[PDB]
Structures are given as C-alpha cells and as structure tokens.
C-alpha cells in the first residue's frame, strides 16, 4: 500500500473547506471518530472535542464557512502504517472581513481501514487570536 491515508484525508479536507464539496471527507471520517482541536471555543465555537462523524462534519462545515486557505506549508511529517504526525502552516483569509491569518498546527492522526478514527490538533492559539482581533 503506497498512498498514505493522511494524504487522502488532506485532499478530502481541502475539497470540503475550499470547494464546499464534502463527499470525500464524509467517506474518510470514521463513524465513531474521536476528535479534538485544542483552542478557545469562545472565539472559535468549532474548536474542542467531538465524537462521531456527524459532529466532525459540522466542525468542518463551520470552518469552511469561516475561512479560505490559499497556501499550505508542510514543515515536518512523521508517517507510520495507520498513523501520522505532522506540522503544517495554513495561510488563509477570513470570510467577509478578508482578514489574513497564518495558522501553525501540529496534527496527530490514527486510521483504521482507511478511515480517520482519531485526530488531535494543537495550534499556536495566542498568535491566532491576536491575528484575528488584529490587536
């Protein structure tokens, strides 16, 4: 097996966030996914822990609504058979206000049977909040 599930997920998520085409993402997310993105839910209600595909698709819908990503930079990637860790920077612009924002994130993923079963994301949340408030 020669195309890692991480890459498939990354493409599927791109389609969902940028083109609002969510079919590939829905295929890849496990029905019982165990998910968390650590950040301030008061500002970004789509952060936090979620269980199950439906709730994770809702997170991704809210993110798609909020941002458009125009550049990706992959800084570190550690691949295993059914797992991966990586560090990536997103350059985006915020819907409506068109605020530019750069987000640096660290992602740990687990897969089973080609589906995403576990995700944990840490990002530079202070830098994010500062950029969003612009103060």
Residues 10-49 touching its own copies, rule: CB under 8 A, are 38-40
Helices 5-19 and 53-66 pack at an angle, to 10 degrees, of 50
Q: How far is the CB of 46 from its own copies (least distance, A)?
A: 15
- Nearest CA among 115, 104, 119 for reference residue 36: 119
The answer to the question of residue 59 lying near its own copies (CB under 8 A) is: no
Q: How far is the CB of 20 from its own copies (least distance, A)?
A: 28
Q: What is the DSSP letter of 3?
A: S
The region of 11-19, 24-32, 64-72, 84-92 touching its own copies under the rule CB under 8 A is 84-92
Residue 115 sits at φ, ψ, to 5 deg, of -115, 145
Q: Is 35 left (phi over 0), alpha (psi -120 to 50) or beta?
A: beta
The region of 3-11, 24-32, 73-81, 91-99 touching its own copies under the rule CB under 8 A is 73-81
Which residues of the chain form contacts with its own copies (CB under 8 A)?
38-40, 75-76, 78, 80, 83-87, 104-106, 108, 120, 122-129
């Amino acid at each position: 097996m020669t195309e890692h599930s991480l890459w498939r997920f990354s493409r599927a998520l791109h389609r969902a966030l940028n083109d609002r085409q969510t079919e590939e993402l829905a295929t890849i997310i496990d029905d019982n996914i165990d998910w968390a993105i650590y950040g301030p839910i008061d500002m970004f209600p789509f952060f936090g822990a979620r269980q199950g595909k439906a709730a994770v698709l809702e997170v991704c819908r809210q993110i798609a609504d909020s941002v458009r990503i125009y550049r990706y930079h992959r800084e570190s990637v550690m691949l295993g058979i059914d797992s991966a860790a990586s560090m990536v920077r997103y350059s985006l612009t915020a819907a409506g206000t068109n605020r530019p924002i750069s987000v640096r994130m660290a992602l740990f993923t687990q897969f089973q049977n080609g589906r995403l079963t576990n995700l944990r994301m840490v990002l530079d949340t202070f830098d994010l909040v500062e950029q969003a408030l612009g103060r």
